[PDB]
Amino acid sequence: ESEYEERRDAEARRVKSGIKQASIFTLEECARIEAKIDEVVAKADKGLYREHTVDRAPLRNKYFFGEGYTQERLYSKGEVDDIPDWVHELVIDRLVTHGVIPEGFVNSAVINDYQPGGCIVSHVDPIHIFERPIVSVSFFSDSALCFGCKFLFKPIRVSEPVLHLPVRRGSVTVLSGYAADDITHCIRPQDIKERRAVIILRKTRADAPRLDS
Ligand SMILES: O=C(O)CCC(=O)C(=O)O
Ligand SMILES: [Mn+2]
């Protein structure tokens, strides 16, 4: 019934207005990047990174490069590891060549690695920390990015998405405007049925607040 359908669809159009998607990477180019992601996981497992580079959760690990953060604040310089050369060579440079982002934009790369059933709770990328657009490239498997969900308790549930955005393996997702600023996004446990990883590429604001030593 409407007005529900009408009002949901109206906001979904607003969200979509701030979403651009690209492919660019072939599946063979994806497998190559996936091999590098596996190398990062292995290196972290051997404890070869700086402490704040690696954050571990039940079904999800995050790997912070370039900049890390926590009212959110960046860590002091040198607390997380530098962006690996392969992220520049295989991912950032490709997106620059294709005009998705300008040269020198990206100074933060985060890899999220999800096991089946993994998720990330609804949030807005800290607007006082990160410039827009926010760019992500997805790997290993197909999934979906949802907008506007609430993660509820008593009992545990995730509410209905305002927008459900399919994200194929190799998909490039570019968030701006409404989709980046005016609504949350998340990954629902139900949309991670197999291992999936994502590289999130961002520019920190020159005036982003930073912890001191
Ligand atoms: O997994 C994704 O595509 C997005 C993850 C995300 O939004 C985040 O890590 O801040
Ligand atoms: Mn996010």
Swiss-Prot record:
Q: Where's the active site on this chain?
A: 69
Key word Metal-binding present: yes
**Chain residues that bind 2-oxoglutarate:** 112, 114, 123, 185, 196
Q: How is the cofactor bound?
A: Binds 1 Fe(2+) ion per subunit.
A GO molecular function held by the record: mRNA N6-methyladenosine dioxygenase activity
The disulfides recorded in the entry are 149-186
Named cofactor requirement(s) = Fe(2+)
> What are the recorded Gene Ontology BP terms?
membraneless organelle assembly; mRNA destabilization; mRNA processing; regulation of mRNA export from nucleus; regulation of mRNA processing; regulation of translation; response to hypoxia; spermatogenesis
Subcellular location(s) per record: Nucleus speckle
Which GO cellular component terms, listed alphabetically, does the Swiss-Prot or TrEMBL entry include?
A: nuclear speck; nucleus; paraspeckles
User: Coiled coil located at which positions?
Assistant: none
Binding positions (Fe cation): 123, 125, 185
Which reaction equations make up its catalytic activity? Answer: an N(6)-methyladenosine in mRNA + 2-oxoglutarate + O2 = an adenosine in mRNA + formaldehyde + succinate + CO2
| UniProt EC number | 1.14.11.53
Top-level EC class, please? Answer: oxidoreductase
Q: Which UniProt keywords apply?
A: Dioxygenase, Disulfide bond, Iron, Metal-binding, Nucleus, Oxidoreductase
Is Cell cycle a UniProt keyword of this protein?
no
Q: What family is it from?
A: Belongs to the alkB family.
Fill in the domain comment: The C-terminal disordered region undergoes liquid-liquid phase separation (LLPS) for the formation of paraspeckle membraneless compartment.
Q: What does this protein do?
A: Dioxygenase that specifically demethylates N(6)-methyladenosine (m6A) RNA, the most prevalent internal modification of messenger RNA (mRNA) in higher eukaryotes. Demethylates RNA by oxidative demethylation, which requires molecular oxygen, alpha-ketoglutarate and iron. Demethylation of m6A mRNA affects mRNA processing, translation and export.
Subunit annotation: Monomer.
Q: What is this protein called?
A: RNA demethylase ALKBH5
- What phylogenetic lineage does the species belong to? Eukaryota, Metazoa, Chordata, Craniata, Vertebrata
What gene codes for this chain? alkbh5
